[PDB]
Amino acid sequence: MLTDPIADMLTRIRNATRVYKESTDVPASRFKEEILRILAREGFIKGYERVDVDGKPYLRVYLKYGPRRQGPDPRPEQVIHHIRRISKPGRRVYVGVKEIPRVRRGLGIAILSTSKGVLTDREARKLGVGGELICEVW
Amino acid sequence: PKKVLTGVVVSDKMQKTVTVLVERQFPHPLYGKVIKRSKKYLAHDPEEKYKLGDVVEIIESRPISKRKRFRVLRLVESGRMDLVEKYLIRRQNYQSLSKRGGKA
Amino acid sequence: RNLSALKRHRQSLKRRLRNKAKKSAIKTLSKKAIQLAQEGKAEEALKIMRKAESLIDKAAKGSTLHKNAAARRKSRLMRKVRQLLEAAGAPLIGGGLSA
Amino acid sequence: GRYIGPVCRLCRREGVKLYLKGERCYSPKCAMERRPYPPGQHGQKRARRPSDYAVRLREKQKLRRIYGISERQFRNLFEEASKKKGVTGSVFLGLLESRLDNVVYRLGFAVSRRQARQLVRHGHITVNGRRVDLPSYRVRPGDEIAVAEKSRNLELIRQNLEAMKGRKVGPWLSLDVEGMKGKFLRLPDREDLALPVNEQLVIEFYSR
Amino acid sequence: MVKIRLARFGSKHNPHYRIVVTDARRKRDGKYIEKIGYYDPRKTTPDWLKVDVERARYWLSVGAQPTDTARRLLRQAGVFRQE
Amino acid sequence: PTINQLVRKGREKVRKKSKVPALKGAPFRRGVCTVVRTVTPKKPNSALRKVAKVRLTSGYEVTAYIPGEGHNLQEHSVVLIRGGRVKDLPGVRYHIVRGVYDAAGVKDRKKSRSKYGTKKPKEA
RNA sequence: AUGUGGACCCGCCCCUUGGGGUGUGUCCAAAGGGCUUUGCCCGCUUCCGGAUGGGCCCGCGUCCCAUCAGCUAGUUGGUGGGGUAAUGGCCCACCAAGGCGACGACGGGUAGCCGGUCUGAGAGGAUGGCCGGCCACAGGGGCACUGAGACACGGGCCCCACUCCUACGGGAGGCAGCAGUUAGGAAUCUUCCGCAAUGGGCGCAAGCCUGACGGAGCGACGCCGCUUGGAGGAAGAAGCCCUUCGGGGUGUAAACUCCUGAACCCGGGACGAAACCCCCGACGAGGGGACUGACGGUACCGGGGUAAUAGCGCCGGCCAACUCCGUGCCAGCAGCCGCGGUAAUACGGAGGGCGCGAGCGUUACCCGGAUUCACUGGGCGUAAAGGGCGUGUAGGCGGCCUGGGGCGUCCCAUGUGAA
Ligand SMILES: [Mg+2]
Ligand SMILES: [Mg+2]
Ligand SMILES: [Mg+2]
Ligand SMILES: [Mg+2]
Ligand SMILES: [Mg+2]
Ligand SMILES: [Mg+2]
Ligand SMILES: [Mg+2]
Ligand SMILES: [Mg+2]
Ligand SMILES: [Mg+2]
Ligand SMILES: [Mg+2]
Ligand SMILES: [Mg+2]
Ligand SMILES: [Mg+2]
Ligand SMILES: [Mg+2]
Ligand SMILES: [Mg+2]
Ligand SMILES: [Mg+2]
Ligand SMILES: [Mg+2]
Ligand SMILES: [Mg+2]
Ligand SMILES: [Mg+2]
Ligand SMILES: [Mg+2]
Ligand SMILES: [Mg+2]
Ligand SMILES: [Mg+2]
Ligand SMILES: [Mg+2]
Ligand SMILES: [Mg+2]
Ligand SMILES: [Mg+2]
Ligand SMILES: [Mg+2]
Ligand SMILES: [Mg+2]
Ligand SMILES: [Mg+2]
Ligand SMILES: [Mg+2]
Incomplete structure (x- = not known):
């Protein structure tokens, strides 16, 4: 089976960006959707949209990259240097609001899910909740 | 607050007493994985009223015998031998594990 | 040598002997009441149980029993005594019992 | 302790002019004045590029031997300005x-x-x-x-x-x-x- | 019984006591019940005797017994306001 | 290992194996000197090395190096042992304290004198 | 006898495990002493309440070995009784046939646990010594007595071992209390002062006891403060340095240039001690000078006054610091790599230098570095490591959507987290 949908998506993204694809398809989940909302609003992708593939729901994800650099290897800088699933099945990770990590001195985010909903760290430190740490994305 | 526990009757072969299997899940100190774990309680059944299979609430009581310091508070949901079976099977795997074979 | 507080030991003996009699009094008086109750001799049986409850509380005045050690010995006694008189008896003198 | 020996031989070893002879290391005879090579039958031979340790060392005996303080007191002081709030570097000198x-x-x-x-x-x-x-x-x-x-x-x-x-x-x-x-x-x-x-x-x- | 005494907490040649509620059976310097003041017998500090006077009244009301010296300091803070 | 495996089994820690069974892990043992033999070193060296089979109060029977120049270690002299593998003799993992009991300290040394247990030269 | 009241059996109601009220019957109290003598003091009996101290029960946590896998007969439960302050197979008769175990039972090994301590950036690792809390023991085993409390270290009985007395029948002992002796050991202190302070027992009090304690003694064992202050040349009966009996350094570094003044001497001299008690007010009233100091004539303050201990390790690389001579795989060095075979900065001396300094080195043990048991944070084609392959039990893990619960998870308040 698939044993981890969020990890799966987070990877599909990481993989597709390394080859500088335009979009990339991920099978749809109200939860995965709620995460990409953050990735857009924090500026790591251009956005997602609910396209249907073989009559089955997916989520085209339009990726951003930096500008065409110079010298040998002209390939552009990634907007997503790093992306890592943290709490995984059989290894659930929960932080209270006192223990939420500051990723990369704030030059990057940590998505996490709470009783108030899926938020970034700066957001969840604002409302004073903690929860299931889902991933870093510096 | 006298401790209160929720669990499954797994034995009725005693007079006025039932064995309760209280499960307790909790995260592991070093590795933080959430781990199930369980413990059996002998509980006071004054009217051989709780029959093998159901889920009850166990309450901390004045001692009644050796190793028997709980009375049965109230039934939660009735029969469900899926848990007894899971427990009865677990007990039967010991049939192997010895010096020879057994039942898997 | 010769700590003069072995005088404490001289007293323990003198006390031990005082207690030990009061116990035996209660013991052989309490059996006598039960055994008079297992025969319907209700008058004599309460005449003696009443005496026994008394030595019980008296013996609980000093250190010999004190506490509910006495209470218990009275509870066990009147309970046994009444039941046996209830195998056909009718408490005649009914001294220490209330019905 | 307190060291207390020949001083204007340390003026020479650290190579930096030092005022341990207080009055005398001003007039043309701190020993540094027209004899700045280190002591010993070796002070004139050529110095090989020191290891980062020697550099850190010499920079410390320099500071310590300025104030004429036993290594016991000194380390005990530095470790206090480490624990202390603010820049660990300068606090030190304020204590000294x-x-x-x-x-x-x-x-x-x-x-x-x-x-x-x-x-x-x-x-x-x-x-x-x-x-x-x-x-x-x-x-x-x-x-x-x-x-x-x-x-x-x-x-x-x-x-x-x-x-x-x-x-x-x-x-x-x-x-x-x-x-x-x-x-x-x-x-x-x-x-x-x-x-x-x-x-x-x-x-x-x-x-x- | 329960008492109110002094438990010595200074240094060699440097005494500092702690007025304390404690069961008499207990060690002098061991686990007491409640601290209710301190006493520096050499008056080296301008504030060499403090007493939670509210509290002293509580322990004296359930039958704490002070030592002769503890009783001194209680009167000095005016625990029993003899007037 | 998976996380479930660390949970089930786990990590196992490391034992200290003491390279000096001076029994009670004391810092020195007394011993009565038996054989005061002479051994030839190994791999890349050559000499006549002074060793000593020692009978320990710890009931042990171990061989130990006699540091310094000459000794004065007879068939029955008594001696003190400390730690110290000698790279060159195998089986020798202890030293003798020059300057204690029958093993009189080295004579006429002027440098490393607190080892070899030579008193202050009377040069004052 | 008296019954304020309390205990017991039946009940009656409230409560809900044996909590509180209530009726009949039964049962249970007591101690006297002193007086500045008929009214004060310290006692005495029953009952309720408080406070302190403690018993028992439960959840959770608490080292290693699976080359320990099955364990259990009072063993698991029941009725009844015994025992206890009280629950309970704690104990006993009778009945049922149960209980525990791979989430490690049974066995073996090791060990007092903790507040803490050491280390580490942290997670973690190591530890439990002083101080404080709890437990256990008091030559070894067992048992009860007395009592509020003991299964009782300086109490009792019995048995076992050791020592001592013995008229040979029988007796006496117990420093793991302060000191001290002895043995063992690498190694661990004075048969000291004192009841002044704090604390304890008893006493109406005066007081008495207190190797609890407060002090002093010994030991660089530890920590911290402090002194040795510093301006000058160099003839080897076997003993002053650097190109051959030869080339500068030691080195502003002195056996003596002034200044100050450790030790030492002389005199003053304490805090710690105000209560208990006496005295007026009522036997706790701002009066007690009633009196009290072991440490100790010490700390500390003032005068006099001397130039007045330096040692230990290291100098091939790691690792701060180099030359001469002697020695020739010898004597020896050595933490690891290594040096010595005639030209040695590595051995041994010397001069010089580096590090620390009343200490400096060696050994031992713990953490570190070690991301080398890797949760943070490692690996397994060839470096160590994929099970010869499958089937599948327990276990771990689990696609999309909706709704309920709120066990996990999160937040606020709160109690606790003693010193
Ligand atoms: Mg007496
Ligand atoms: Mg009467
Ligand atoms: Mg032990
Ligand atoms: Mg002994
Ligand atoms: Mg008593
Ligand atoms: Mg008794
Ligand atoms: Mg006793
Ligand atoms: Mg004794
Ligand atoms: Mg000896
Ligand atoms: Mg006193
Ligand atoms: Mg003492
Ligand atoms: Mg005064
Ligand atoms: Mg007064
Ligand atoms: Mg170097
Ligand atoms: Mg050497
Ligand atoms: Mg040579
Ligand atoms: Mg050399
Ligand atoms: Mg010092
Ligand atoms: Mg590690
Ligand atoms: Mg580490
Ligand atoms: Mg890992
Ligand atoms: Mg590896
Ligand atoms: Mg291989
Ligand atoms: Mg294979
Ligand atoms: Mg799911
Ligand atoms: Mg919840
Ligand atoms: Mg809180
Ligand atoms: Mg604290």
Whole structure:
């Protein structure tokens, strides 16, 4: 089976960006959707949209990259240097609001899910909740 | 607050007493994985009223015998031998594990 | 040598002997009441149980029993005594019992 | 301990001019003056590029041997400015300059720190009217450092406090030449010191 | 019984006591019940005797017994306001 | 290992195996000197090395190096042992304390004198 | 006898495990002493309440070995009784046939646990010594007595071992209380002062007891403060340095240039001690000088006054610091790599130098570095490591959507986290 949908998506993204694809398809989940909302609003992708593939729901994800650099290897800088699933099945990770990590001195985010909903760290430190740490994305 | 526990009757072969299997899940100190774990309680059944299979609430009581310091508070949901079976099977795997074979 | 507080030991003996009699009094008086109750001799049986409850509380005045050690010995006694008189008896003198 | 041996052989080993002979390391004979090569039957041969350790070391014996302090007191001090709030580098120097044997040297009562030490040890110095005979006593700000009533008429004081006429003191001391009573206004800052020392190494040396 | 005494907490040649509620059977310097003051017998500090006087009244009301010296300091703070 | 495996089994820690069974892990043992033999070193060296089979109060029977120049270690002299493998003799993992009991300290040394247990030269 | 009241059996109601009220019957109290003598003091009996101290029960946490896998007969439960302050197979008769175990039972090994301590950036690792809390023991085993409390260290009985007395029948002992002796050991202190302070027992009090304690003694064992202050040349009966009996350094570094003044001497001399008690007011009233100091004539303050202990390790690289001579795989060095075979900065001396300094080195043990048991944070084609392959039990893990619960998870308040 698939044993981890969020990890799966987070990877599909990481993989597709390394080859500088335009979009990339991920099978749809109200939860995965709620995460990409953050990735857009924090500026790591251009956005997602609910396209249907073989009559089955997916989520085209339009990726951003930096500008065409110079010298040998002209390939552009990634907007997503790093992306890592943290709490995984059989290894659930929960932080209270006192223990939420500051990723990369704030030059990057940590998505996490709470009783108030899926938020970034700066957001969840604002409302004073903690929860299931889902991933870093510096 | 006298401790209160929720669990499954797994034995009725005693007079006025039932064995309760209280499960307790909790995260592991070093590795933080959430781990199930369980413990059996002998509980006071004054009217051989709780029959093998159901889920009850166990309450901390004045001692009644050796190793028997709980009375049965109230039934939660009735029969469900899926848990007894899971427990009865677990007990039967010991049939192997010895010096020879057994039942898997 | 010769700590003069072995005088404490001289007293323990003198006390031990005082207690030990009061116990035996209660013991052989309490059996006598039960055994008079297992025969319907209700008058004599309460005449003696009443005496026994008394030595019980008296013996609980000093250190010999004190506490509910006495209470218990009275509870066990009147309970046994009444039941046996209830195998056909009718408490005649009914001294220490209330019905 | 206190070292206490031939001094103007350390002027030479650290290679930096040092004022341990207080009066004499000014006139053309600090030994540094026209003999700046290290001591021993080797001071003139060519020096190989030192290891980063030797650099950190020499930079530390430099600072320590300026104040004439046992390594026991020194490390115990650094480890305090580490635990202390603020920049661990400079706090150190403020503690070293808060030592009463040094303050008495900075206020121009003796010519060297060495002679200054001996004036504390012999109860010629008072802090806030009371006598003090401890070269390691830590002067705080607002502490007026006087000279003993008994010793006011003493030879060395008359001579050494006289030459103080005209000279300026740090922008954290305030001496009064008349009653021979200076005052500790403020904990000195790094730029207040002209110490030919790079504490950044001294920090690194103990971070080993 | 329960008492109110002094438990010595200074240094050699430097005494500092702690007025304390404690069961008499207990060690002098061991686990007491409640601290209710301190006493520096050499008056080296301008505030060399403090007493939670509210509290002393509570322990004296359930039958704490002071030592002769503990009773001194209680009167000095005016625990029993003899007037 | 998976996380479930660390949970089930786990990590196992490391034992200290002492390279000096001076029994009670004391810092020195007394011993009565038996054989005061002479051994030839190994791999890349050559010499006549002074060793000593020692009978320990710890009931042990171990061989130990006699540091310094000459000794004075008879068939029955008594001696003190400390730690110290000698790289060159195998089986020798202890030293003798020059300057204690029958093993008189080295004579006429002027340098490393607190080892070899030579008193201060009377040069004062 | 008296019954304020309390205990017991039946009940009656409230409560809900044996909590509180209530009726009949029964049962249970007591101690006297002193007086500045008929009214004060300290006692005495029953009952309720408080406070302190403690018993028992439960959840959770608490080292290693699976080359320990099955364990259990009072063993698991029941009724009844015994025992206890009280629950309970704690104990006993009778009945049922149960209980525990791979989430490690049974066995073996090791060990007092903790507040803490050491280390580490942290997670973690190591530890439990002083101080404080709890437990256990008092030559070894067992048992009860007395009592509020003991299964009782300086109490009792019995048995076992050791020592001592013995008229040979029988007796006496127990420092793991302060000191001290002895043995063992690498190694661990004075048969000291004192009841002044704090604390304890008893006493109406005066007081008495207190190797609890407060002190002093010994030992660089530890920490912290402090002294040895510093301006000058160099003839080897076997003993002053550097190109051959030869080339500078030691080195501003002195056996003596002034200054100050450790030790030492002389005199003053304490805090710690105000209560208990006496005295007026009522036997706790701002009066007690009633009196009290072991440490100790010490700390500390003032006068006099001497130039007045330096040692230990290291100098091939790691690792700060180099030359001469002697020695020739010898004597020896050595933490690891290594040096010595005639030209040695590595051995041994010397001069010089580096590090620390009343200490400096060696050994031992713990953490570190070691991301080398890797949760943070490692690996397994060839370096160590994929099970010869499958089937599948327990276990771990689990696609999309909706709704309920709120066990996990999160937040606020709160109690606790003693010193
Ligand atoms: Mg008596
Ligand atoms: Mg009567
Ligand atoms: Mg043990
Ligand atoms: Mg013994
Ligand atoms: Mg009593
Ligand atoms: Mg008794
Ligand atoms: Mg006793
Ligand atoms: Mg004894
Ligand atoms: Mg011996
Ligand atoms: Mg007293
Ligand atoms: Mg003492
Ligand atoms: Mg006074
Ligand atoms: Mg008064
Ligand atoms: Mg070097
Ligand atoms: Mg050497
Ligand atoms: Mg040579
Ligand atoms: Mg050499
Ligand atoms: Mg020192
Ligand atoms: Mg590690
Ligand atoms: Mg580590
Ligand atoms: Mg890992
Ligand atoms: Mg590896
Ligand atoms: Mg291989
Ligand atoms: Mg294979
Ligand atoms: Mg799911
Ligand atoms: Mg919840
Ligand atoms: Mg809280
Ligand atoms: Mg605390």
